[PDB]
Design a binder for this molecule. Sequence first.
Ligand SMILES: CCC(CC)c1nn(-c2ccc(F)cc2)c2nc(N3CCN(C(=O)OC(C)(C)C)CC3)cc(C(=O)O)c12
Lengths: 10, 253
Amino acid sequence: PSLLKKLLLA
Amino acid sequence: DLKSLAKRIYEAYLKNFNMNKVKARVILSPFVIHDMETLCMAEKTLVAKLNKEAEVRIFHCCQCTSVETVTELTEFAKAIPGFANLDLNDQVTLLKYGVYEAIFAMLSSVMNKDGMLVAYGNGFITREFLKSLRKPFCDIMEPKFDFAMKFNALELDDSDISLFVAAIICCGDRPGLLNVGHIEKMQEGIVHVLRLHLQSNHPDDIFLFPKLLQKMADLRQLVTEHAQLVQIIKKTESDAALHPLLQEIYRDM
Ligand SMILES: CCC(CC)c1nn(-c2ccc(F)cc2)c2nc(N3CCN(C(=O)OC(C)(C)C)CC3)cc(C(=O)O)c12
């Protein structure tokens, strides 16, 4: 799991 | 709904970006950093203490600004109608290749011929002082100033730039995209709305839209050459530890 996915999933 | 697309994108622009053109133009009309002395003077008040070379200090401050802007660009893209409906992998691909094109486009709003704003509008570093730095740190912002000088001559406002940035993010040309036809449809709507907005906002320049199309191609080339400078620093500058989010963005670009 990638950091860009963290900003998109929030 | 495409009737309220320009208004919604402009509002998401004003909502998510701490710095815009009308705010930067107000400040540019604010401590000045023009040498090593004024740089240390500004850092005594705007940076917290918890040692590195001045070129690495400006490097870390600039890359930190990019990290916050990526977060703002992520939230901005979420407010674009249809973006949240895409697959999660497609949303990652659009942001990965789009953020730095939008960042250098938005960078023009805080740039003039003599320098750029830093530290959220609290500082102003001069163009010559950036060129007076050692290589390769002095070769970073110079091509961005050149792009900004031609881009600022178009005299766009925040309403124009908001649609321009939306068109940059919603680009069906990014490598590895899945729903290419639907993203192309999203781009078509944003570009068409941008076309009408440019016709209403800039009736004195009926060829402004093809000018902006060329700026999109200029930004992609400016980013690809910028990524080559990122790898030079990553490989030959140990003190310049690169942010993990920026590591993930530049990787496999
Ligand atoms: C190439 C390594 C890389 C580190 C990943 C880097 N090194 N420098 C640099 C270092 C020393 C210096 F003397 C001038 C520059 C950089 N400046 C950037 N810019 C872009 C956003 N930034 C802004 O203010 O963004 C708005 C206007 C609020 C949207 C100004 C700084 C962006 C990056 C970047 O690739 O991440 C970067």
